[PDB]
Amino acid sequence: FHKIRNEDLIFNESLGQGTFTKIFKGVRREVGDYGQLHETEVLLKVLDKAHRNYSESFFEAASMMSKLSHKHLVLNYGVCVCGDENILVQEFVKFGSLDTYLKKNKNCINILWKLEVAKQLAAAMHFLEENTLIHGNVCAKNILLIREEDRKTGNPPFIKLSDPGISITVLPKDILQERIPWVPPECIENPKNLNLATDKWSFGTTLWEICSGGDKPLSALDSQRKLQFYEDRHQLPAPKAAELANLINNCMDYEPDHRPSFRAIIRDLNSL
């Protein structure tokens, strides 16, 4: 990761928090192409100082993801590790996270919009799978809406998959349990079971979010009941708009080896 000086960063408003992180809108002063000076809007992810021991995991998968370039993968500009800070400097996406967008615009999002977003996410995951790169935290909160749909000009929405944050292989067990049903059953059993098949399960959970107007699956269950949901081998309910329900359940297969390739997933989506 390219190193950015704290002096070139301005922190502005808080945009919320992730796991052991705080998120801010900011500005980066930089010299761009042709030597032109820019003041570039950025997204700043700050690891909590109290959790500095997660800094290696905080940067790792993000870095590996940034070693591959792809139109559906978020751009990381670099890191700021001046002083006692651990900061990821990321492109600022105009419309933010998909989960909030789905809820704010539920009445204005139809099946064709959901199908296009599902196809784009599948394309990103197929690219990762072909590169045998595990993401590890596929969820609607980690999908960013670059561009809104514009029916008047035929433009579909356009999304990017963002970074996974600190890996589930190092997070406390109580946090993994709260992340059911995004974290697959084999990873609740053993977080070291994280593998490519992990992302297929979470992708199914993410499709459920996309189809459920930003509802969170199993949000009414506490961690104990989320555990028993997996022990009883339950599946998620079909979303009211159930067009993707079979694909969701096919991806959320309790046998990791039976989860379909993203090539097959893309073929299924194209058939709808």
- DSSP assignment of 110-175, as one string? -HHHHHHHHHHHHHHHHHHHHTT-------GGGEEEEE--BGGGTBPPEEEE----S-TTTS-HHH
Separation CA 88–CA 77 (nearest Å)? 8
Q: Structure solved using which method?
A: X-ray
Buried residues in 218-230 as b, exposed as e (16+ CB within 10 A): beeeeeeebeebb
Distances (CA, A) of 8 to 27, 37, 82, 200: 8, 12, 11, 39
Let me know the angle formed at the C-alpha of 268 by 182 and 243, rounded to the nearest 5 degrees: 70
What's the number of CA atoms in the CB half-sphere (13 Å) around residue 35? 0
Identify the CA nearest to 125 among candidates 266, 271, 272: 266
Number of other residues whose CB lies within 10 A of the CB of residue 30: 16
Give Rg (Cα) of the chain.
19
Distances (CA, A) of 12 to 15, 66, 95: 9, 25, 17
Number of other residues whose CB lies within 10 A of the CB of residue 47: 25
Retrieve residue 236's tokens.
């998620």
Identify the CA nearest to 139 among candidates 162, 166, 108: 162
Retrieve residue 208's tokens.
């459920």
Separation CA 216–CA 146 (nearest Å)? 22
Residue 42 · residue 28 · CB < 8 Å: yes
Resolution limit, Å: 1.9
Retrieve residue 272's tokens.
């709808």
Q: Where are the alpha helices (DSSP H) in the chain?
A: 55-66, 98-104, 111-130, 173-178, 185-189, 196-211, 223-231, 245-251, 262-271
Separation CA 82–CA 76 (nearest Å)? 17
Separation CA 247–CA 265 (nearest Å)? 8
